[PDB]
Amino acid sequence: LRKCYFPYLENGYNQNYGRKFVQGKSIDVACHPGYALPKAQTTVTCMENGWSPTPRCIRVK
Asked: Is 1 helix (H, G, I), strand (E, B) or coil?
């Protein structure tokens, strides 16, 4: 029952970097044009500290 720390996105806008959220939460993560999250998502779900879908901004193109 953790509290995910929001990490730094190399190819994304770390607007939320520095914030902590409790597991069972979601939050939007804007990445640069052509970068996004898994499952075509823009939102990450706080789970077990390590964000369910993982905020990393992969290149969609």
From this structure: coil
Separation CA 43–CA 37 (nearest Å): 7
Q: Which CATH architecture has domain 1-61?
A: Ribbon (2.10)
What method did the depositors use to determine the structure? Answer: NMR
Cα 54 from chain centroid?
A: 6
**Spatial distance between the Cα atoms of 35 and 12, rounded to a whole number of angstroms:** 7
b/e map of 41-56 (b: 16 or more CB within 10 Å)? Answer: eeebbbbeeebbeebb
Q: Is 30 exposed, middle or buried (0-12, 13-18, 19+ CB in 10 A)?
A: middle
Tokens of 3: 């509290």
